[PDB]
Amino acid sequence: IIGGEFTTIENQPWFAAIYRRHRGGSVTYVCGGSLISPCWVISATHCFIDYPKKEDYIVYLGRSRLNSNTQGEMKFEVENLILHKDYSADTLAYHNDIALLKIRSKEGRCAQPSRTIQTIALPSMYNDPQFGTSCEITGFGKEQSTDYLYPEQLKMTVVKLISHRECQQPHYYGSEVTTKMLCAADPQWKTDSCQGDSGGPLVCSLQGRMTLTGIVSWGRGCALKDKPGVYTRVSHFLPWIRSHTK
Ligand SMILES: NC(N)=NC(=O)c1nc(Cl)c(N2CCCCCC2)nc1N
């Protein structure tokens, strides 16, 4: 997250931190995710497209910090890693950038809701908020496009949904953004998602509900003028999601 503020998991209790354990026994952070039901975390396919063995992944819930344990966090194995069959990557964009991780504790359980863990609601299909709506993003991604390291403390910020019309202009992303995507940015370009935030939630109040409206997918650079963040548009994917979750 570029700009924005530090926060704790209690302010975004659906956020899931996904890591990969290495043969060296080293474990490195991969991407964010969102708990949409007790046994399911939703994230972005591009995060795991290169290494698809479920075995080498670990999901934490209730976690406020990148490389130290947060009191009340839970650790999970990945029982099923479901990557979208129609995923592809273009020059900038990713398509169908959506994945499901069915989580199981080594003791066989799914998530137990707490002060630090809650599911987030999905939207009704094709139901999104209007352009100009303020939504929240959260992650452990870079604080500067140019950083080597990720921050140790969880961050979040606020961005406004952009119109597709606005996003499809040539100076923005032109032809590479599609209707299966959503664009969100700061009006002044101050704050944004970045590398390491992928898979993480874009949350909006829809109806009277905090709803998961997007998944962090891509952008050029981070916090660049006329280069907004692009997110998987969740409302388009209810059939896919329900297929696996039933
Ligand atoms: N929102 C804005 N402006 N950018 C981003 O969200 C964003 N930016 C980058 Cl650099 C990024 N990378 C870099 C390699 C390509 C994709 C995976 C990791 N992923 C993102 N999701």
Which of 34, 43, 64, 97 is catalytic? The answer is 97
Atom 21 of ligand 1, nearest CA residue: 218
Give nearest CA residue, ligand 1 atom 16.
218
Instruction: Record the resolution, in angstroms.
Output: 2.2
Exposure string over 77-107, b if 16+ CB within 10 A, otherwise e: bbeebbbbeebeeeeebbbbbbbbbbbbeee
Calculated CA dihedral for residues 111, 234, 91, 198, nearest 10 degrees: -30
Q: Where are the alpha helices (DSSP H) in 90-178?
A: 164-167
97 belongs to the catalytic site: yes
Helix H or strand E segment including 238: helix 238-245
Q: Cα(222) to centroid of ligand 1, in Å?
A: 7
Residue with structure tokens 């999601």? 241
Q: Where are the domains of the chain?
A: 1-12+120-235, 13-119+236-246
The answer to whether 177 touches 230, Cβ cutoff 8 Å, is yes
How remote is the CA of residue 228 from the centroid of ligand 1, in Å? 10
Cβ neighbors of 188 (< 8 A, separation 6 or more) are none
Distance 231 CA to ligand 1 centre (A): 10
Query: Residues of 184-201 as b/e, b for ≥16 C-beta within 10 angstroms?
Result: bbbeeeebbbbbbbbbbb
Residue with CA at minimum distance from ligand 1 atom 4: 219
CA of 225 to the centre of ligand 1 (A): 14
Give residues (CB < 6 A) around ligand 1: 145, 192-195, 197-198, 216-219, 222, 227, 229
Range 13-119+236-246 has CATH code 2.40.10.10: yes
Residue 235 CA, chain-centre distance (Å), reads: 15
159 Cβ contact list (under 8 Å, min separation 6): 134, 135, 136, 137, 184, 185, 186, 191, 192, 202, 228, 229
- In the chain, the N- to C-terminal Cα span, in Å, equals 33
158, 172, 194, 224, best to mutate for ligand 1 pocket (most atoms within 8 Å of CB):
194
Burial of 234 (0-12, 13-18, 19+ CB in 10 A): buried
Which residue minimizes the CA distance to atom 12 of ligand 1? Answer: 195
